[PDB]
Design a protein around this ligand. Structure first.
Ligand SMILES: C/C=C/C[C@H](C)C[C@H](C)C(=O)c1c(O)cc[nH]c1=O
Ligand SMILES: C/C=C/C[C@H](C)C[C@H](C)C(=O)c1c(O)cc[nH]c1=O
Lengths: 459, 451
């Protein structure tokens, strides 16, 4: 491919998006804080958007060229993370007003970071369109930075990755690999490279046990796990994996009055999203208890649910105490479970299921892609705006959903030696758990990176 | 700005490059291993390239959108570094033939990385156009990965950043700032967060003293410093800061038969670059000695220079023993020197200079940009191509600024700050030339002492 080819391709995708926005009188994305934070969920718009990102990344990459790509990458990339690190730890998102500029001098005194250094940090932020400088000596928000205003979930995501995942695990992954090999054992992770025998610590042990700190309402023991919970919530409130996409991937209303057992459901945020939109549904959120868990679970629980979402302490490897429920639901649980452990969990589900009225629903990455809703299956336009060679938009070796899915793969690899799976690998795994399992649906909304898989037991 | 405006801008810039390559019968950049590694150095082409990169980055950013930008960023960007870390530590660039594909199985056996994990690592590389998969189960190079084949300097750059700068310094820079504030003391850096007063370790002490390892022919003491020197050479052999750009930024030939004193000139690589192109020049490379320095200096030294480039052990803060030389030259030395230290060095140069004969040349970032070479239609906006708040040369300038900030609390300067600093060293100093080739982030500043 050439620069010109990429540019033409880009133009084609922009035209699809730009025409949809105009024909529907929808505001255009910009870098201003009042920009829409996403494009319409229309499947044609989203396919075009995913291809556009991919081609624009290819274009900047090609134009930088082979001589400067590795040179500039190892110089600059790491400092985009460092910039966000400063922005979060100094609370700079909240200190810059959303709709008004602020001087470096005033910003410096608000956050306690000297003017010279502040100026330097902000300048790097500008190059990735986080904040801008509208006039000399002044800082203002962009859309990218404004979305973090007042949102500790956004800051949780920054700090979890920069203060835990990267320094403790991913920076050490090479060493981990050479020491223990290609492992599925969560002990074979960065913090244990020099641990004495029997003194290894698991990621989730560190998260729940460390008591030297505090985060967003939880002081002491488990503050890191609470922050990790915030990150989970962050991915549900907006963007590609937004929780409301679950409502489009399965007919929750069709269940009628029914009980959903939410196994490994964190703090029940996703359960609350589904139950808010489906008044006939009861959710049992099953999770390992913590000293602060119930206090936080009920503080977040919307009163409008009238108690339909409740918490039940439960070990996911143990016997399932809720028998004959309509749905047993696991959202992004099994990608941290190697085969033997996932089979244990699945067999616990099977024993509690009534094969003639229970379903097992999982939400997880399907590496090679799920299927779109039936209404989006037929391609009604041109292939250029819908597919990249043989791959659905967003997939293939340079696809942005492919990229994100590898990012998630690497994250669970880093912290627990987890891994993502293809559809065939999911079906193989479930049938090893019980040969009666059948994949009845595998729905991935366009622009999402996860699929909702509907499993049943048939004779 | 909107998606359509960005796309429109991109088309214009592309057209400039596309037209020039066609009209000059020059191969088009692609991702194939045989692609040109850079665009032509013609100033109009480079201006369009810099704007094109900037607009294309704006376009991918805007298309990702505000909801997904921070979410995707903190998920993915760190693993682009981790992928390069695997590729370097397992020597995968060399393991994959430049012009043939290799199966994951065969690559796995060559590098000793299990197949499943190998596949996973390679797949992340593909998304940034490092390697590709031309057929199921097979790996091939791209232009981006092929440039690292057989080049330990590229591996040096990967490992210096990922195994030293990032974990020891930049990841700890917030903690360092909260502990010491906006310090300019090189002891007030990440490794010393819990050091006893007086027991702080300097970055360059760690570099020259650590003996637990080896790198590219240097075993034991100072292997890290030798690898650092490889990274400096890496930025001289190609890309934006290539040493041959120095030949366009100053009239070296106009010096005639002349001596250049190269203060802090590393292992003399840059000196050799200039001396190979200018046969009438003699270079004196002044640098702090190391047990392996002279061996490595002479191994590297091109035979065809016939001794014109020599090594003189020297403390840059000490009296300058070469009096009256035509040129005293410092390349990317002063951006690691706070004002007081820089003034000490500059006054050592002034004492040795003949004001009517000697020049002082410095190569450094000028944060607000130098002037184009003399040999190079209408201007819109406040900034030359590559500069301004989203410019890609600005971005590289800041990355370098942050690099020296991280390891020694150094900093980059504007042209006005340079002039102020030099005039504080000696009021006779005058900036006679400040030349920055288009596509380069550094400028060559020519200083003289005037009455
Ligand atoms: C399939 C999508 C799942 C949404 C999650 C936010 C992905 C994220 C990588 C994740 O699972 C993490 C994790 O499991 C453990 C530690 N740190 C994480 O970030
Ligand atoms: C102005 C351009 C200079 C070219 C250099 C390769 C820049 C690079 C950031 C650098 O100076 C480094 C340094 O001084 C010390 C440690 N590690 C570095 O990387």
């Amino acid at each position: 491919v050439t620069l010109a080819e990429l540019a033409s391709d880009i133009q084609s995708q922009v035209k699809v998006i730009d025409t949809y926005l105009t024909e529907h009188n929808l505001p255009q994305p910009t870098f201003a804080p009042d920009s829409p934070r996403e494009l319409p969920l229309d499947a044609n718009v989203q396919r075009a958007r995913l291809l556009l990102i991919e081609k624009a990344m290819a274009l900047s990459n090609l134009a930088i060229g082979a001589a400067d790509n590795l040179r500039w990458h190892c110089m600059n990339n790491k400092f985009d993370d460092m910039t966000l690190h400063f922005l979060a730890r100094y609370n700079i998102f909240d200190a810059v007003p959303r709709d008004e500029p602020i001087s470096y001098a005033e910003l410096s005194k608000k956050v306690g970071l000297a003017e010279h250094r502040l100026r330097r940090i902000m300048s790097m932020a500008y190059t990735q369109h986080y904040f801008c400088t509208p006039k000399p000596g002044f800082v203002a928000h962009t859309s990218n930075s404004a979305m973090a205003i007042g949102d500790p979930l956004a800051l949780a995501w920054i700090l979890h990755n920069i203060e835990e995942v990267q320094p403790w695990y991913s920076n050490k992954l090479v060493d981990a690999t050479m020491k223990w090999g290609d492992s599925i054992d969560p002990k074979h992770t960065g913090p244990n490279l020099n641990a004495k025998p029997g003194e290894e610590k698991l990621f989730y042990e560190i998260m729940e046990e460390d008591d030297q700190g505090e985060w967003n309402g939880v002081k002491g023991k488990g503050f890191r796990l609470w922050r990790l919970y915030d990150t989970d919530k962050f991915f549900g409130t907006g963007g590609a994996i937004k929780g409301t996409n679950l409502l489009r991937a399965f007919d929750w209303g069709g269940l009628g009055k029914a009980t959903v057992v939410d196994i490994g459901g964190i703090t029940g945020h996703l359960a609350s999203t589904v139950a808010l939109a489906n008044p006939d549904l009861t959710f049992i959120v099953q999770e390992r208890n913590q000293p602060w868990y119930e206090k936080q679970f009920y503080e977040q629980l919307p009163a409008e649910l009238n108690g339909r979402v409740s918490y039940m302490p439960h070990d996911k490897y143990a016997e399932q105490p809720v028998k004959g429920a309509d749905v047993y639901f696991m959202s992004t649980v099994l990608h941290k479970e190697p085969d033997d452990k996932a089979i244990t969990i699945l067999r616990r589900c099977v024993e509690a299921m009534d094969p003639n009225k229970s379903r097992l629903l999982t939400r997880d990455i399907v590496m090679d892609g799920g299927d779109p809703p039936a209404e989006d299956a037929v391609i009604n336009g041109r292939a250029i705006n819908s597919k990249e060679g043989s791959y659905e938009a967003g997939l293939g070796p340079t696809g942005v959903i492919t990229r994100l899915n590898i990012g998630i793969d690497f994250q669970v690899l880093a912290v627990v030696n987890g891994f993502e799976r293809t559809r065939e690998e999911w079906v193989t795994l479930f049938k090893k758990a019980d040969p009666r399992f059948a994949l009845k649906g595998c729905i991935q909304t366009v622009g999402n990176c996860a699929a909702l898989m509907e499993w049943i037991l048939e004779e």
